[PDB]
Amino acid sequence: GDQLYTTLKNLLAQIKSHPSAWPFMEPVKKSEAPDYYEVIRFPIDLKTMTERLRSRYYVTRKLFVADLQRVIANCREYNPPDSEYCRCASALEKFFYFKLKEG
Length: 103
Hints:
Elements lengths: L2 H15 L17 H5 L6 H9 L6 H18 L5 H19 L1
Helix pairs in contact: 1-3, 4-5
């Protein structure tokens, strides 16, 4: 497979493996929280990362970084501060940056 794609796929797999991914897996349920998309007019989630990756959105890892940071941002913006969601996003962030430092 293409080196970048494969790297990002592995990185994404690691991200999904990292428990803290849990809240951000699927898109926010429009039926329940439509307001997510109306406020956070910058949608992303890990399924969407997978879609974008498959769609070769991430022409450079920098864009993956940006979008993952977008998940973190979206979370912290939308959810009340210092929540389980914030903690999860923070664990995700640290884990992610750790993976980046590893490779």
